[PDB]
Amino acid sequence: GSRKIIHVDMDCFFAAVEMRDNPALRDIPIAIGGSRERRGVISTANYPARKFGVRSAMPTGMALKLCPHLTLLPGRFDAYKEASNHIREIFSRYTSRIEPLSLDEAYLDVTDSVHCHGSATLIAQEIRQTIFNELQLTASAGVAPVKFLAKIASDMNKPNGQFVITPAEVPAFLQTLPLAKIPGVGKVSAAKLEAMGLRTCGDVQKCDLVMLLKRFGKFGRILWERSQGIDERDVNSERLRKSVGVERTMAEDIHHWSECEAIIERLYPELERRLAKVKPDLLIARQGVKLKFDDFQQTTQEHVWPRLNKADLIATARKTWDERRGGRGVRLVGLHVTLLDP
DNA sequence: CTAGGGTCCTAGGACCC
DNA sequence: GGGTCCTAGGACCCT
Ligand SMILES: [Mg+2]
Ligand SMILES: [Mg+2]
């Protein structure tokens, strides 16, 4: 009863699209991200820029210190969405059991496939080749018996490669696997785990489940399971979007309500247009606002509300401004809706 | 020197039974 | 005294 899970993941996705569409960018360091003047971060970078230490989520001023010749690009999201749609259609030639996790990646359950004589290894290779042949972009892939190991595997032979983990290979693989490599174990958790002497799955294997449950709740059960290669999460092709948000960080902090209100007047038409794409009648479950202050504390206030409404978002932002700001400057203003359930 | 798009989990009081 | 809803916050994910 062992499943075959593929995780397909595009290489340097945004940057690879830009180099395909402008070959001049192929061999110089580039990154998609907000400018230093816009107080931006790097969304991603190509390998020439990564060589300097440029990484996703790096503050753009830091990227430019490591890599002074970095070429900064704004991003063409319709181009990325187009490539995303194309690779998802390519996935569908092989199975309907597709769970996209973001624009550039997806799980595939090919357990019941008899493409490529049932070889998940050859299916992954054929998908990667097809993506290259039809989009001129490269992808990497991971093959394993459960989701999380497949996702880990797709990172290990990047770029333009793949890695297969068989059931026989799972124990040796897990023994020295850093906990931080597990999707969902981030910096904070890995630092907590590190401070109690838990660095790898092999370390967690020597732990009591009951202790982990006390110390971490349901996360502790996940940690205990994953550290044993256990991951029964099914590939789910039926997930739906639950929220829509529009937010912007300004280049300078704001200190006046008039400025906040003026920002909202610019955010609102964009929120309306994006909601209308998925809900033409604008009917929603909740709407609300977000402020981020100059000390990086952020607050949200959202409430049951039946239909996108600009004046109520302004009014709510006014309360948040007056009630929770405490005189600090504001670097970000955001609008948000929660979508109706079905 | 710190984005913007999101998902999920937690947790207290409200409300219900 | 248990479920669920309302709400806020925060870790984490992707590029
Ligand atoms: Mg990728
Ligand atoms: Mg990805």
CSV table of C-alpha atoms (C1' of nucleotides) and ligand atoms in Angstrom, one decimal:
chain,number,residue,atom,x,y,z
A,1,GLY,CA,0.0,0.0,0.0
A,2,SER,CA,2.9,2.4,-0.8
A,3,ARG,CA,1.9,5.5,-2.7
A,4,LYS,CA,4.0,7.3,-5.4
A,5,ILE,CA,4.1,11.1,-4.8
A,6,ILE,CA,5.9,13.6,-7.2
A,7,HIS,CA,6.6,17.1,-6.1
A,8,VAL,CA,7.4,19.3,-9.2
A,9,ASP,CA,9.0,22.7,-8.6
A,10,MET,CA,10.1,25.3,-11.1
A,11,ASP,CA,13.7,26.5,-11.1
A,12,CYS,CA,14.2,30.2,-10.0
A,13,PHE,CA,10.7,30.6,-11.3
A,14,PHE,CA,10.2,34.4,-11.7
A,15,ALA,CA,13.8,35.0,-12.7
A,16,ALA,CA,13.7,32.1,-15.2
A,17,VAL,CA,10.7,33.6,-16.9
A,18,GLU,CA,12.4,37.0,-17.2
A,19,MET,CA,15.6,35.4,-18.6
A,20,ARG,CA,13.5,33.4,-21.2
A,21,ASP,CA,11.7,36.6,-22.2
A,22,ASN,CA,14.8,38.7,-22.3
A,23,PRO,CA,18.0,36.7,-23.1
A,24,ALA,CA,20.1,39.7,-22.2
A,25,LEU,CA,19.5,38.9,-18.5
A,26,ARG,CA,20.7,35.3,-18.7
A,27,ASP,CA,24.3,35.7,-17.5
A,28,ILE,CA,24.2,38.8,-15.3
A,29,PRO,CA,22.9,38.9,-11.7
A,30,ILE,CA,19.2,39.7,-11.6
A,31,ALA,CA,16.4,39.6,-9.0
A,32,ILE,CA,12.7,40.3,-8.9
A,33,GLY,CA,12.1,42.6,-6.0
A,34,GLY,CA,11.2,46.1,-4.7
A,35,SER,CA,13.8,48.8,-5.0
A,36,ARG,CA,15.8,50.0,-2.0
A,37,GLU,CA,13.9,53.3,-2.3
A,38,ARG,CA,10.6,51.4,-2.1
A,39,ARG,CA,12.0,49.5,1.0
A,40,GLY,CA,11.7,46.3,-0.9
A,41,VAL,CA,12.8,42.7,-0.5
A,42,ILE,CA,14.0,40.2,-3.1
A,43,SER,CA,11.3,37.8,-4.4
A,44,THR,CA,13.8,35.6,-6.1
A,45,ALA,CA,17.2,35.8,-7.9
A,46,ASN,CA,18.9,34.0,-10.7
A,47,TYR,CA,22.0,31.8,-10.1
A,48,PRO,CA,24.5,34.6,-11.0
A,49,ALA,CA,23.0,36.7,-8.2
A,50,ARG,CA,22.6,33.8,-5.7
A,51,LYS,CA,26.4,33.3,-6.1
A,52,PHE,CA,26.8,36.6,-4.3
A,53,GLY,CA,24.5,35.5,-1.5
A,54,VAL,CA,21.3,37.1,-2.8
A,55,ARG,CA,18.3,35.1,-1.6
A,56,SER,CA,14.4,35.3,-1.5
A,57,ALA,CA,13.1,37.5,1.4
A,58,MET,CA,16.4,39.3,1.7
A,59,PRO,CA,16.0,43.1,2.2
A,60,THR,CA,16.9,44.7,-1.1
A,61,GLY,CA,19.4,47.1,0.4
A,62,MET,CA,21.3,44.0,1.7
A,63,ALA,CA,21.1,42.3,-1.7
A,64,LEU,CA,22.7,45.4,-3.3
A,65,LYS,CA,25.5,45.4,-0.7
A,66,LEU,CA,26.4,41.8,-1.5
A,67,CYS,CA,25.9,42.3,-5.2
A,68,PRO,CA,26.3,45.9,-6.3
A,69,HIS,CA,25.6,45.2,-10.0
A,70,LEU,CA,22.3,43.4,-9.2
A,71,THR,CA,19.7,44.2,-11.9
A,72,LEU,CA,16.3,44.7,-10.2
A,73,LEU,CA,13.1,43.8,-12.0
A,74,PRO,CA,9.5,44.7,-11.0
A,75,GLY,CA,7.9,41.4,-11.9
A,76,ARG,CA,5.3,40.5,-14.6
A,77,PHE,CA,2.7,38.5,-12.7
A,78,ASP,CA,0.5,37.7,-15.7
A,79,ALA,CA,3.6,36.1,-17.3
A,80,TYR,CA,4.1,34.0,-14.2
A,81,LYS,CA,0.5,33.0,-14.0
A,82,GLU,CA,0.6,32.0,-17.7
A,83,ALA,CA,3.5,29.8,-17.1
A,84,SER,CA,1.8,28.4,-14.0
A,85,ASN,CA,-1.4,27.6,-16.0
A,86,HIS,CA,0.7,25.8,-18.7
A,87,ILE,CA,2.6,23.6,-16.3
A,88,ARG,CA,-0.6,22.6,-14.5
A,89,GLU,CA,-2.1,21.6,-17.8
A,90,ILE,CA,1.0,19.5,-18.5
A,91,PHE,CA,0.5,17.9,-15.1
A,92,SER,CA,-3.1,17.0,-16.0
A,93,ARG,CA,-1.9,15.0,-19.0
A,94,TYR,CA,-0.5,12.6,-16.5
A,95,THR,CA,-3.1,12.5,-13.6
A,96,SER,CA,-6.0,14.5,-12.2
A,97,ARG,CA,-4.5,14.0,-8.7
A,98,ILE,CA,-2.8,17.4,-8.7
A,99,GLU,CA,-2.4,19.7,-5.6
A,100,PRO,CA,-0.8,23.0,-6.5
A,101,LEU,CA,0.9,24.7,-3.6
A,102,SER,CA,1.8,28.0,-5.2
A,103,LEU,CA,2.2,29.2,-8.8
A,104,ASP,CA,5.3,27.1,-9.5
A,105,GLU,CA,4.9,23.8,-7.7
A,106,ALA,CA,2.4,21.0,-7.2
A,107,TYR,CA,2.1,17.5,-5.7
A,108,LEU,CA,1.0,14.7,-8.0
A,109,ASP,CA,-0.2,11.3,-6.8
A,110,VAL,CA,0.8,8.9,-9.6
A,111,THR,CA,0.2,5.8,-7.5
A,112,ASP,CA,-2.6,4.7,-9.9
A,113,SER,CA,-0.9,5.9,-13.1
A,114,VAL,CA,0.2,3.5,-15.7
A,115,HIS,CA,2.0,6.2,-17.7
A,116,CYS,CA,5.6,5.2,-18.2
A,117,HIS,CA,4.9,1.6,-17.1
A,118,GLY,CA,4.0,3.0,-13.7
A,119,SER,CA,7.4,4.5,-13.1
A,120,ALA,CA,7.1,7.6,-11.0
A,121,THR,CA,10.8,8.3,-11.8
A,122,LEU,CA,10.1,8.3,-15.6
A,123,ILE,CA,6.8,10.3,-15.2
A,124,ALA,CA,8.7,13.0,-13.3
A,125,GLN,CA,11.4,13.0,-16.0
A,126,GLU,CA,8.9,13.2,-18.8
A,127,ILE,CA,7.0,16.1,-17.1
A,128,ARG,CA,10.3,18.0,-16.6
A,129,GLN,CA,11.2,17.5,-20.2
A,130,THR,CA,7.8,18.5,-21.4
A,131,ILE,CA,7.9,21.7,-19.3
A,132,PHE,CA,11.3,22.5,-20.8
A,133,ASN,CA,10.2,21.6,-24.3
A,134,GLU,CA,7.0,23.7,-24.2
A,135,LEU,CA,7.9,26.6,-21.9
A,136,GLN,CA,11.7,26.8,-22.3
A,137,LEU,CA,11.9,26.8,-18.4
A,138,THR,CA,13.5,24.1,-16.3
A,139,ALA,CA,11.9,22.3,-13.4
A,140,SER,CA,13.2,20.0,-10.7
A,141,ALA,CA,11.2,17.1,-9.1
A,142,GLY,CA,11.1,14.9,-6.1
A,143,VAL,CA,9.7,11.4,-5.9
A,144,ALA,CA,8.8,9.8,-2.6
A,145,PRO,CA,6.2,7.7,-0.8
A,146,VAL,CA,4.6,10.6,1.1
A,147,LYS,CA,4.2,14.4,0.4
A,148,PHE,CA,6.8,15.9,2.7
A,149,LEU,CA,9.7,13.7,1.6
A,150,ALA,CA,8.8,14.3,-2.1
A,151,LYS,CA,8.9,18.1,-1.5
A,152,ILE,CA,12.3,17.8,0.3
A,153,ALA,CA,13.6,15.6,-2.5
A,154,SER,CA,12.7,18.2,-5.2
A,155,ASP,CA,15.2,20.6,-3.6
A,156,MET,CA,18.1,18.2,-3.5
A,157,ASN,CA,19.1,17.9,-7.2
A,158,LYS,CA,18.1,21.5,-8.2
A,159,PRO,CA,18.3,23.0,-10.7
A,160,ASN,CA,17.1,20.9,-13.6
A,161,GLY,CA,17.3,17.6,-11.8
A,162,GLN,CA,15.3,15.2,-9.6
A,163,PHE,CA,15.8,12.9,-6.6
A,164,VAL,CA,14.0,9.7,-5.7
A,165,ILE,CA,13.5,8.4,-2.2
A,166,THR,CA,12.4,4.7,-2.0
A,167,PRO,CA,10.8,3.1,1.1
A,168,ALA,CA,14.0,1.2,1.8
A,169,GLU,CA,16.0,4.5,1.7
A,170,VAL,CA,13.6,6.4,4.1
A,171,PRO,CA,15.3,5.5,7.5
A,172,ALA,CA,18.8,6.5,6.4
A,173,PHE,CA,17.5,9.6,4.8
A,174,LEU,CA,15.6,10.7,8.0
A,175,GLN,CA,18.4,9.9,10.4
A,176,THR,CA,20.5,13.0,9.7
A,177,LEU,CA,17.7,15.2,8.1
A,178,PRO,CA,17.6,18.6,9.7
A,179,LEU,CA,14.2,19.3,11.2
A,180,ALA,CA,14.2,22.8,9.5
A,181,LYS,CA,14.0,21.0,6.2
A,182,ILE,CA,10.5,19.8,7.0
A,183,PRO,CA,7.9,22.1,5.4
A,184,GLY,CA,6.2,23.8,8.4
A,185,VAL,CA,9.2,23.8,10.6
A,186,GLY,CA,10.5,27.3,10.3
A,187,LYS,CA,13.1,29.5,12.0
A,188,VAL,CA,11.3,29.9,15.3
A,189,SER,CA,10.5,26.2,15.7
A,190,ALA,CA,13.9,25.1,14.6
A,191,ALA,CA,15.5,27.4,17.2
A,192,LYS,CA,13.2,26.0,20.0
A,193,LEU,CA,14.0,22.5,18.9
A,194,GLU,CA,17.7,23.3,18.7
A,195,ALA,CA,17.7,24.6,22.2
A,196,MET,CA,16.3,21.3,23.6
A,197,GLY,CA,18.9,19.3,21.6
A,198,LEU,CA,16.7,18.4,18.7
A,199,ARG,CA,18.3,19.1,15.4
A,200,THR,CA,17.5,16.2,13.1
A,201,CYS,CA,14.7,13.7,12.7
A,202,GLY,CA,17.0,11.1,14.3
A,203,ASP,CA,17.0,13.2,17.4
A,204,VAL,CA,13.2,13.4,17.5
A,205,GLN,CA,13.0,9.7,17.0
A,206,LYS,CA,14.4,9.2,20.5
A,207,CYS,CA,11.6,11.5,21.9
A,208,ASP,CA,8.4,10.5,23.7
A,209,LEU,CA,5.3,11.4,21.8
A,210,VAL,CA,3.6,12.5,25.0
A,211,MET,CA,6.4,14.9,25.8
A,212,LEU,CA,6.2,16.4,22.3
A,213,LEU,CA,2.4,16.8,22.6
A,214,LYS,CA,2.8,18.7,25.9
A,215,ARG,CA,5.7,20.9,24.6
A,216,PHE,CA,4.2,21.7,21.2
A,217,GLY,CA,0.5,20.6,21.0
A,218,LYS,CA,-0.5,19.3,17.6
A,219,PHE,CA,2.7,20.5,16.1
A,220,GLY,CA,4.4,18.0,18.4
A,221,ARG,CA,2.4,15.2,16.9
A,222,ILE,CA,3.4,16.3,13.4
A,223,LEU,CA,7.1,16.5,14.4
A,224,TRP,CA,6.9,13.0,15.9
A,225,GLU,CA,5.2,11.6,12.8
A,226,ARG,CA,7.4,13.3,10.2
A,227,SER,CA,10.5,12.2,12.0
A,228,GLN,CA,9.4,8.7,11.3
A,229,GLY,CA,8.6,9.2,7.6
A,230,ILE,CA,4.9,9.2,8.5
A,231,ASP,CA,2.8,11.6,6.4
A,232,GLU,CA,-0.6,10.3,5.5
A,233,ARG,CA,-1.8,13.6,4.0
A,234,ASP,CA,-3.6,12.9,0.8
A,235,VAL,CA,-3.0,14.8,-2.4
A,236,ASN,CA,-6.1,17.0,-2.6
A,237,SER,CA,-7.1,18.4,-5.9
A,238,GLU,CA,-10.1,20.3,-4.5
A,239,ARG,CA,-8.7,23.1,-2.4
A,240,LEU,CA,-10.2,26.6,-2.8
A,241,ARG,CA,-9.1,30.1,-2.1
A,242,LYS,CA,-10.4,31.5,1.2
A,243,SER,CA,-9.2,35.2,1.3
A,244,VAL,CA,-8.1,38.1,-0.9
A,245,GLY,CA,-5.8,40.9,0.3
A,246,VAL,CA,-4.2,44.0,-1.1
A,247,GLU,CA,-1.5,45.8,0.9
A,248,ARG,CA,1.3,48.2,0.3
A,249,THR,CA,4.4,49.3,2.2
A,250,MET,CA,5.1,53.0,1.5
A,251,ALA,CA,8.6,54.3,0.9
A,252,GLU,CA,8.2,56.7,3.9
A,253,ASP,CA,6.3,56.0,7.0
A,254,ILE,CA,3.0,57.9,7.3
A,255,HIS,CA,2.0,59.9,10.4
A,256,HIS,CA,-1.4,61.5,9.3
A,257,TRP,CA,-4.8,60.0,8.9
A,258,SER,CA,-5.2,62.0,5.6
A,259,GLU,CA,-2.3,60.0,4.2
A,260,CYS,CA,-3.7,56.6,5.4
A,261,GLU,CA,-7.1,57.4,3.8
A,262,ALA,CA,-5.5,58.5,0.5
A,263,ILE,CA,-3.6,55.1,0.4
A,264,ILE,CA,-6.8,53.2,1.0
A,265,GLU,CA,-8.5,55.1,-1.9
A,266,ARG,CA,-5.8,53.6,-4.1
A,267,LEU,CA,-5.9,50.1,-2.6
A,268,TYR,CA,-9.7,49.7,-2.8
A,269,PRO,CA,-10.2,49.6,-6.6
A,270,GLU,CA,-7.5,47.0,-6.9
A,271,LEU,CA,-9.2,44.8,-4.2
A,272,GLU,CA,-12.5,45.3,-5.9
A,273,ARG,CA,-11.1,44.2,-9.3
A,274,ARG,CA,-9.4,41.1,-7.9
A,275,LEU,CA,-12.5,40.1,-5.8
A,276,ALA,CA,-14.7,40.6,-8.9
A,277,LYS,CA,-12.6,38.1,-10.9
A,278,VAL,CA,-13.7,35.3,-8.5
A,279,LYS,CA,-17.0,36.8,-7.1
A,280,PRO,CA,-18.6,39.1,-9.5
A,281,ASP,CA,-21.3,40.1,-7.1
A,282,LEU,CA,-18.7,41.0,-4.4
A,283,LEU,CA,-20.5,38.9,-1.8
A,284,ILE,CA,-18.1,38.0,1.0
A,285,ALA,CA,-18.0,36.7,4.6
A,286,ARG,CA,-15.7,39.3,6.3
A,287,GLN,CA,-13.7,42.4,5.4
A,288,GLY,CA,-11.1,44.3,7.3
A,289,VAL,CA,-7.8,46.2,7.4
A,290,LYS,CA,-4.2,45.9,8.3
A,291,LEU,CA,-1.7,48.4,9.7
A,292,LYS,CA,2.0,47.8,10.2
A,293,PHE,CA,3.7,50.3,12.5
A,294,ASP,CA,7.3,51.5,12.5
A,295,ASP,CA,8.2,49.1,15.3
A,296,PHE,CA,7.0,46.3,13.0
A,297,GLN,CA,4.1,45.3,15.3
A,298,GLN,CA,1.1,44.7,13.0
A,299,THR,CA,-2.6,44.6,13.8
A,300,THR,CA,-5.6,43.5,11.8
A,301,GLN,CA,-9.2,44.2,12.5
A,302,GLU,CA,-11.8,42.4,10.4
A,303,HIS,CA,-15.5,41.7,10.9
A,304,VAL,CA,-18.5,39.9,9.5
A,305,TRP,CA,-19.7,41.9,6.5
A,306,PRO,CA,-21.7,40.8,3.5
A,307,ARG,CA,-20.3,42.7,0.5
A,308,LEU,CA,-17.1,44.6,-0.3
A,309,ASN,CA,-17.6,48.2,0.9
A,310,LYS,CA,-15.0,51.0,0.7
A,311,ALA,CA,-16.5,53.4,3.3
A,312,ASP,CA,-16.6,50.6,5.9
A,313,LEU,CA,-13.0,49.8,5.3
A,314,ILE,CA,-12.1,53.5,5.7
A,315,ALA,CA,-14.1,53.7,8.9
A,316,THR,CA,-12.5,50.6,10.2
A,317,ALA,CA,-9.0,51.9,9.3
A,318,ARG,CA,-9.9,55.1,11.1
A,319,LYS,CA,-10.7,53.2,14.3
A,320,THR,CA,-7.5,51.2,14.0
A,321,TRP,CA,-5.5,54.4,13.3
A,322,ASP,CA,-7.0,56.1,16.3
A,323,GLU,CA,-7.4,53.1,18.7
A,324,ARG,CA,-4.3,50.9,18.3
A,325,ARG,CA,-1.6,53.2,16.8
A,326,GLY,CA,-0.3,54.8,20.0
A,327,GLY,CA,1.4,57.6,18.1
A,328,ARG,CA,3.8,55.4,16.1
A,329,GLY,CA,4.5,55.9,12.4
A,330,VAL,CA,2.8,53.5,9.8
A,331,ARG,CA,4.8,51.7,7.1
A,332,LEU,CA,2.0,49.5,5.6
A,333,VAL,CA,-1.7,49.7,5.0
A,334,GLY,CA,-3.7,46.7,3.9
A,335,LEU,CA,-7.2,45.7,2.9
A,336,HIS,CA,-8.6,42.2,3.3
A,337,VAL,CA,-11.7,40.1,2.6
A,338,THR,CA,-12.6,36.6,3.8
A,339,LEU,CA,-14.5,34.6,1.2
A,340,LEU,CA,-17.8,32.8,1.7
A,341,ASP,CA,-17.3,29.2,2.6
A,342,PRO,CA,-18.4,27.0,-0.3
B,1,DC,C1',17.2,46.3,6.8
B,2,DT,C1',13.3,44.2,6.7
B,3,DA,C1',7.1,42.5,0.3
B,4,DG,C1',2.9,40.8,-1.0
B,5,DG,C1',0.4,36.9,-2.1
B,6,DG,C1',-1.6,33.6,0.9
B,7,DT,C1',-2.8,28.9,4.5
B,8,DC,C1',-3.2,27.1,9.0
B,9,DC,C1',-3.2,26.9,14.2
B,10,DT,C1',-4.2,28.9,18.7
B,11,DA,C1',-6.9,30.9,22.1
B,12,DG,C1',-10.5,33.7,25.1
B,13,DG,C1',-15.3,35.2,25.5
B,14,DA,C1',-19.8,34.8,23.4
B,15,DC,C1',-23.6,32.0,22.6
B,16,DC,C1',-25.8,27.8,22.7
B,17,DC,C1',-27.2,23.4,24.9
C,1,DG,C1',-19.8,22.4,31.8
C,2,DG,C1',-18.7,20.8,25.5
C,3,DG,C1',-19.3,22.6,20.5
C,4,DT,C1',-18.9,26.4,17.5
C,5,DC,C1',-18.5,31.3,16.1
C,6,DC,C1',-16.1,35.7,16.3
C,7,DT,C1',-11.8,37.8,16.4
C,8,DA,C1',-6.6,38.8,16.8
C,9,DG,C1',-2.2,37.3,16.4
C,10,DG,C1',1.6,34.9,14.6
C,11,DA,C1',4.4,31.0,12.4
C,12,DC,C1',5.0,29.5,8.0
C,13,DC,C1',4.7,28.9,3.0
C,14,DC,C1',5.7,30.7,-2.1
C,15,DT,C1',8.3,33.8,-5.5
D,1,MG,MG,10.7,27.1,-7.3
D,2,MG,MG,8.1,26.4,-5.3
